[PDB]
Amino acid sequence: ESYDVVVVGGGPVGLATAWQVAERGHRVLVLERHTFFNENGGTSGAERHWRLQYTQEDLFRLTLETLPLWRALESRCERRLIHEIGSLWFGDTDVVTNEGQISGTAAMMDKLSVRYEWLKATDIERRFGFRGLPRDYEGFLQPDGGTIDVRGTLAALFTLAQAAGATLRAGETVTELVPDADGVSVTTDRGTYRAGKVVLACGPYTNDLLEPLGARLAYSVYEMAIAAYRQATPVTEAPFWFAFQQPTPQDTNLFYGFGHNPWAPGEFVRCGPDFEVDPLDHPSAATGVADRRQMDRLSGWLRDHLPTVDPDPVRTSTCLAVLPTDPERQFFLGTARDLMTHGEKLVVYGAGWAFKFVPLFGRICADLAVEDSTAYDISRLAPQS
Ligand SMILES: *Cc1cc2c(cc1C)nc1c(=O)[nH]c(=O)nc-1n2C[C@H](O)[C@H](O)[C@H](O)COP(=O)(O)OP(=O)(O)OC[C@H]1O[C@@H](n2cnc3c(N)ncnc32)[C@H](O)[C@@H]1O
Ligand SMILES: O=C(O)c1ccccn1
Ligand code: NA
Question: What range(s) does the FAD dependent oxidoreductase domain occupy (predicted)?
């Protein structure tokens, strides 16, 4: 068979891309090795954080440009997907993390006229229920950030893509890509295809298809523990939070919580460590069982520092984080033009904290696949070998 665009991967980025390509009238196929809506990749769990604020100006401009794309998606599917519970960042204000740097981000919020409330340790403890914070911990609340309904977003994208004519095929694994001057040959475990262009939206598996073409992107894959905790004390404010700390010799020493869940039964909140440790050689090494040390660290930090939750988790899971190895890079998004001959026929989304960007990155991957250019400024994000 032949298509204008073949999308490898049916996670949120692949689905958003297919929606955008199909609604523009092009023939698109999505190939997903497992099932749509699976929780074995980078998109597990119910919640992700929406935030405006970024340490990097170009990415901050992109969140501001993505907000209307979320509102458009919400209107198309008749479901609110972002719930503005707040974005709370606190801790050591100078440490640089994969989340950003507090001090630099506050200066960027000042620059871009984005509102926030600055908080001292006593204010954080009083308002949000944290305890035992070091006296020099400080940060801010950005009240327009909040929580994204992951499963609602996926269902919306699936529905929109299919309604627009995309072919969504699960249980099929892409095993080889060979771009040439005339298009791209796609081989799977079930057959072969020709494509005008291919979009790689395959999460941690990107390098499997790039390495036979002589390319490899510099990302690391981490099997991160996520766990659900019962809210023990009712609270007035329950934002997303992220604790910025200096690393320890053993781990990155960062913790977060997705905050109040406005659509779910009960009163459970998800928290996790954000640890850049024990990168997987290959995603096939994932166990799908929350790492014991990560869980001891997470529950132990919550036990002391967020006693509004019961620190004995009611459920645990994993999620695969895919992050640039270079801390100066946040995302890989672009074509493979610089990576291989005929690489412009491969559009790649390759690493980062991207759920907040799903409507944007789908639109950009569609732009690159069908119009060979995008209006958005993503120069810095271009793929890195
Ligand atoms: C894991 C994680 C991520 C995360 C986060 C916290 C954790 C612990 N918090 C975030 C947040 O608060 N805000 C945010 O903006 N992002 C956050 N993230 C990141 C986000 O979850 C991921 O960036 C995003 O969900 C990734 O989506 P993407 O569509 O890129 O990737 P995926 O869900 O892994 O899907 C890829 C699919 O491809 C299929 N696959 C893989 N190989 C093949 C081949 N060869 N053939 C066919 N299909 C293939 C996979 O099965 C998968 O479904
Ligand atoms: O992008 C974010 O804001 C994010 C990423 C990882 C963990 C929590 N939040
Ligand atoms: Na509830």
Answer: 4-368
Q: Ligand 2: which of 43, 47, 49 to mutate, most ligand atoms within 8 Å of CB?
A: 49
Kindly give the distance from the C-alpha atom of residue 343 to the centroid of ligand 1, in angstroms, as a whole number: 23
Q: Which of 137, 125, 55 is nearest to 90 (CA)?
A: 137
Q: Where are the domains of the chain?
A: 1-85+145-218+326-385, 86-144+219-325
For residue 151, give both structure tokens.
Answer: 């499963």
How many CB atoms are closer than 10 A to CB 298? 26
Q: What angle do CA 69, 205, 81 make, to 5 degrees?
A: 25
Instruction: Kindly report the number of other CB atoms within 10 A of residue 304's CB atom.
Output: 12
Count CB-CB contacts under 10 A for residue 109. Answer: 18
Contact predicate 211/237, CB 8 Å: no
Q: Breaks in the chain at C–N > 2.5 Å: after which residues?
A: none
Q: How far is the CA of 297 from the centre of ligand 1 (A)?
A: 24
Catalytic residue flag (residue 297):
no
Say which CATH superfamily domain 86-144+219-325 falls into.
Answer: D-Amino Acid Oxidase, subunit A, domain 2 (3.30.9.10)
CATH architecture, range 1-85+145-218+326-385 = 3-Layer(bba) Sandwich (3.50)
- Helix, strand or coil, per DSSP, at residue 283: helix
Write the Ramachandran bin of 44: left for phi over 0, alpha for psi from -120 to 50, otherwise beta. Answer: beta
